[PDB]
Amino acid sequence: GAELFTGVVPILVELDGDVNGHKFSVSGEGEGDATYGKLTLKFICTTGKLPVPWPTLVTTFSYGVQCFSRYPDHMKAHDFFKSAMPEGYVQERTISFKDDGNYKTRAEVKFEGDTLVNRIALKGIDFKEAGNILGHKLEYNYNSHNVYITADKQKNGIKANFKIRHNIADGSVQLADHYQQNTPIGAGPVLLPDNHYLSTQSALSKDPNEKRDHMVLLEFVTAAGITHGMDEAYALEHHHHHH
C-alpha cells in the first residue's frame, strides 16, 4: 500500500456535523505528499458560518489522514495507515474539551479511484453556549504535538491518546483530550506497529481572495521514537547513548 503514496495524492474531505444542535457541513480538497510528510488542504464551510472554531476540527479533518505521515525507511514496518490501503480504515475519536463539551467523530479513510477520501460524521454535545468553543474564543493558530501510536492487537488496528492545546484569546489554553481508535476496512493483512509517535506541525492560513468561511491547513507529519541503526553503526553523536 506504500506504493500508493510515493507521489502527490489528491485528497477529499467531507464532514457533516451537529454540535449542540448547530448543524454544519464542510468540504475540503488537498494534496498529500507522504515522501515529505506533507499535507496541504483547504476546507470550506458549505453551510455558511462554521459554528465552532476552525482549529477545533484540524485533527478530525487531518490528524485525519495520517496515511500521509512520513515513516522513515527504518520505521516503515510500523506504518499501519498505509498498510490498510486501498481498502481503508475506520478512525473514531472522542475529543473532550476540558470544562466544556465533547466531539465524537466517526470517519472512513480510503481510496476512491486515485483519490484519498476522509468521510466524517461529527457529533458534539455538552458545550457551553458562551464557552471557548461556541463563544469563538480560540485563536486562529496551532501548536506542534506528538501523537503516541500503540497497537491494538485484539482489533487488528491501532489506538492513540494525546492532548491538543488550543491557544485562547485571553492567553490561556483550551485542552482537547483525544482518544483515537483505528481499524482496517479490508480483510487483508495490516502492519501492527511497535510503540512510536507522529510528530505533527500545523500552520493555519487563509486565502485573501476567498470570501467563504474557510481554513487552509499546511501540515508536516513525521514518524519517530525508534532510533535508526545508523547511529551505532557509524558512531553518530546525535542520539541518546552511553559511554
Binding residues for Ca ion (CB under 5 A): 31, 194, 231, 236-239
What are the distances in angstroms from CA 59 to CA 89, 126, 144, 155, 202?
Answer: 16, 20, 12, 22, 10
In the bound complex, what is the minimum distance in angstroms from residue 224's beta carbon to Ca ion?
Answer: 14
For Ca ion, give the closer residue by CB, 3 or 237: 237
Q: How far is the CB of 142 from Ca ion (least distance, A)?
A: 21
Looking at the Cβ atoms of 30 and 53, the one nearer to Ca ion is 30
User: Which value, in Å, is the radius of gyration of the alpha carbons in the chain?
Assistant: 18
> Nearest approach, Cβ of 232 to Ca ion (angstroms)?
8
Q: Classify 81 in phi/psi space as left (phi over 0), alpha (psi -120 to 50) or beta.
A: alpha
Asked if residue 139 lies in contact with residue 174, where contact means CB atoms within 8 angstroms, the answer is no
Q: Which amino acid is at 13?
A: V
* Nearer of residues 143 and 195 to Ca ion, judged by Cβ: 195
CB of 243 to Ca ion, least distance (A): 6
SS3 letters across 159-173: EEEEEEEEEECCCCE
If the CB atoms of residues 16 and 29 are measured against Ca ion, the closer one turns out to be 29
Nearest-angstrom CA–CA distance, 190 and 7: 21
Q: Which amino acid is at 237?
A: E
Burial of 241 (0-12, 13-18, 19+ CB in 10 A): exposed
Q: Which residue is nearest to Ca ion (CB)?
A: 239
Work out how close the CB of 42 gets to Ca ion at its nearest, in angstroms, rounded to a whole number: 10
39 vs 133, beta carbon nearer Ca ion:
39
